[PDB]
Design a protein that fits this description.
Layout lengths: L5 H5 L9 E2 L2 E2 L7 E3 L6 E3 L13 E4 L2 E4 L5 E3 L6 E3 L9 E2 L4 E5 L6 E6 L5 E7 L4 E6 L4 E6 L6
Antiparallel strand pairs: 1-2, 3-4, 5-6, 7-8, 9-10, 10-11, 12-13, 13-14
The protein binds 2-acetamido-2-deoxy-beta-D-glucopyranose.
2-acetamido-2-deoxy-beta-D-glucopyranose binds next to loops.
Family: Belongs to the LDLR family.
Protein name: Low-density lipoprotein receptor-related protein 2
Organism: Homo sapiens (Human)
Length: 154
């Protein structure tokens, strides 16, 4: 009808299998392929270009996309997500007006405990992986305090 029906006429000059539609040359494209302006020739979709394709390094492929992970990260079953190889929980330390508030949600516990409470006004927080220590700074005290993750050796 509308189109020249070239799909039926001659594969309709469609890169992918032509799909003769009553209007004419419709053609098609497999997953991960997009029709061009002629809507007959298929292109390659760069899934890596799309944000959130995978948690880590991405490799565009024909109609699909390969992804990698960090040495400390494990690729999930879906192949589009990386998860930490180490089983240790994440200690989401958050400073407070006079204390340090840390959350351990391992095994959906939501362990919210105040690691340090004898503080004037703590602003910055950081940790050392090698020594397993926690560094934080107090504005009013004007000092940089250090302690272990067990809240000791302050
Ligand atoms: C805290 O952890 C460190 C590293 O394991 C250890 O050396 C230190 O003795 C611990 N302190 C307490 C009292 O938990």
């Amino acid at each position: 009808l509308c189109n020249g029906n070239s799909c039926s006429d001659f594969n309709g000059g469609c890169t992918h299998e032509c799909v003769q539609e009553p209007f004419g040359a419709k053609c098609l494209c497999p997953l991960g392929f997009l029709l061009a302006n002629d809507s007959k020739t298929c292109e390659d979709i760069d899934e890596c270009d799309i944000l959130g394709s995978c948690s880590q390094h991405c490799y565009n492929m024909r109609g699909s996309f390969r992804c990698s992970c960090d040495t400390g990260y494990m690729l999930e079953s879906d192949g589009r997500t990386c998860k930490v190889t180490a089983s240790e929980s994440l200690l989401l330390l958050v400073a407070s007006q006079n204390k340090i508030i840390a959350d351990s949600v391992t095994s959906q516990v939501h362990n919210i405990y105040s690691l340090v409470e004898n503080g004037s006004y703590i602003v910055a927080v950081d940790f050392d992986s090698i020594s397993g220590r926690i560094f934080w700074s107090d504005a009013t005290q004007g000092k940089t305090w250090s302690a272990f993750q067990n809240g000791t050796d302050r």
